[PDB]
Amino acid sequence: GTILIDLSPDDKEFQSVEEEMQSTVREHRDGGHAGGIFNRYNILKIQKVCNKKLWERYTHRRKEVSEENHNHANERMLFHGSPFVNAIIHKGFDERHAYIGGMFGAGIYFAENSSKSNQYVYGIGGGTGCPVHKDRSCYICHRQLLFCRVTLGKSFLQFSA
Amino acid sequence: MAHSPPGHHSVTGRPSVNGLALAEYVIYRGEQAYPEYLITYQIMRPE
Ligand SMILES: Cc1ccc(-c2nc3c(O)cccc3c(=O)[nH]2)cc1
Ligand SMILES: [Zn+2]
């Protein structure tokens, strides 16, 4: 039941999503090993993901969390990069999309830095890079990231390297 | 998947060495995220 609706580049919504993508690029400690060497992106398309059943699943849970946290969902907009992007937009997030070996345990991981999510587009550590050229720093091939609505509720703070 | 720590709905990973890094977050229930935008892009070679 998912449909994808293209946003026009003249649309305010396109422009505010592009600005969050571009302005949250940083340098990474691996020198570009996982995600490539870059300071900015060429945005090719932005699409709104529309699925009534998946939206109602999200809002049902948001309301449960809010009622457990003094009517505060603590909702954020965060990036997610994954080899499973195509399954996620059709079926929603579930246990199959978790980073089993993540340093905060098996869960679904999201980033404020779009460039952090870019490291996972082709798999953990960048995998073997793009399928066509086997290049983690490929400048030709088209990549996809998700910009997601995320309910944090009461969040456990881990101070970490 | 693992469970959230007792009494919590998520984990926040605060950067503690690299002063430029932003936070990372983990949820343990797929129902706590909705994939609202799909962004297609290329990384650009610095000049
Ligand atoms: C199979 C798999 C593994 C990790 C990710 C992932 N990890 C992240 C992380 O460890 C920190 C911040 C963001 C991400 C992310 O976007 N995807 C996505 C899919
Ligand atoms: Zn390529």
Side-chain angles (χ1 to χ4, degrees), chain A residues 133-145:
Chain A
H133 307 99
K134 305 307 173 199
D135 185 357
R136 291 184 292 268
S137 194
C138 186
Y139 298 110
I140 299 161
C141 288
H142 293 191
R143 304 180 182 214
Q144 293 186 317
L145 271 187

Side-chain angles (χ1 to χ4, degrees), chain A residues 13 42 44-45 47 49 68 104 106 108 110 112-113 118 140 143 147 149 151-152 154-156 158 160, chain B residues 2 8-10 12 14 16 22-23 25 27-29 32-42 44:
Chain A
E13 211 178 334
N42 180 27
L44 298 164
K45 190 182 286 283
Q47 296 165 297
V49 177
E68 291 174 355
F104 311 115
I108 305 166
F110 294 87
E112 288 181 6
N113 285 119
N118 174 74
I140 299 161
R143 304 180 182 214
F147 191 44
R149 194 175 291 269
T151 288
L152 301 174
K154 179 169 166 52
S155 196
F156 186 93
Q158 186 63 262
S160 52
Chain B
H8 300 79
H9 303 102
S10 72
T12 295
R14 179 194 161 118
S16 92
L22 304 178
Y25 301 87
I27 63 177
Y28 303 88
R29 296 261 233 117
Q32 273 169 236
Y34 182 82
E36 210 152 314
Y37 299 93
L38 180 65
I39 300 170
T40 308
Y41 67 101
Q42 292 160 316
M44 285 178 72

Side-chain angles (χ1 to χ4, degrees), chain A:
Chain A
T2 293
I3 76 171
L4 303 177
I5 302 296
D6 282 27
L7 297 178
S8 166
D10 300 322
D11 186 332
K12 68 184 178 172
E13 211 178 334
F14 184 107
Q15 291 162 15
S16 61
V17 177
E18 166 157 21
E19 181 63 15
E20 187 74 355
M21 182 84 174
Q22 298 286 14
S23 64
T24 63
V25 177
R26 62 170 177 90
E27 293 181 310
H28 289 269
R29 283 154 71 81
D30 72 358
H33 185 267
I37 302 175
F38 64 97
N39 300 317
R40 65 195 169 100
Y41 311 106
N42 180 27
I43 304 292
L44 298 164
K45 190 182 286 283
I46 307 182
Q47 296 165 297
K48 173 100 81 163
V49 177
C50 305
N51 188 310
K52 185 161 171 292
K53 173 169 131 57
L54 292 179
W55 176 249
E56 283 167 8
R57 182 169 92 114
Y58 177 71
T59 60
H60 185 262
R61 178 55 182 165
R62 184 176 65 183
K63 184 162 176 293
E64 296 182 335
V65 174
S66 162
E67 286 176 1
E68 291 174 355
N69 197 50
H70 47 261
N71 308 307
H72 178 46
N74 196 24
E75 180 175 273
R76 306 300 175 78
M77 292 298 302
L78 296 170
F79 298 96
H80 186 79
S82 180
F84 312 125
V85 56
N86 206 71
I88 290 161
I89 63 173
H90 288 105
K91 291 149 145 279
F93 286 104
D94 67 36
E95 71 286 348
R96 302 191 295 285
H97 310 126
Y99 182 9
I100 297 306
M103 295 170 60
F104 311 115
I108 305 166
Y109 285 61
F110 294 87
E112 288 181 6
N113 285 119
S114 69
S115 60
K116 176 55 158 193
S117 292
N118 174 74
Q119 296 185 317
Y120 295 86
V121 164
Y122 297 130
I124 297 159
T128 51
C130 66
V132 175
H133 307 99
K134 305 307 173 199
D135 185 357
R136 291 184 292 268
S137 194
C138 186
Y139 298 110
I140 299 161
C141 288
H142 293 191
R143 304 180 182 214
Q144 293 186 317
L145 271 187
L146 297 170
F147 191 44
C148 303
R149 194 175 291 269
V150 183
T151 288
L152 301 174
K154 179 169 166 52
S155 196
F156 186 93
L157 204 64
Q158 186 63 262
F159 288 71
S160 52

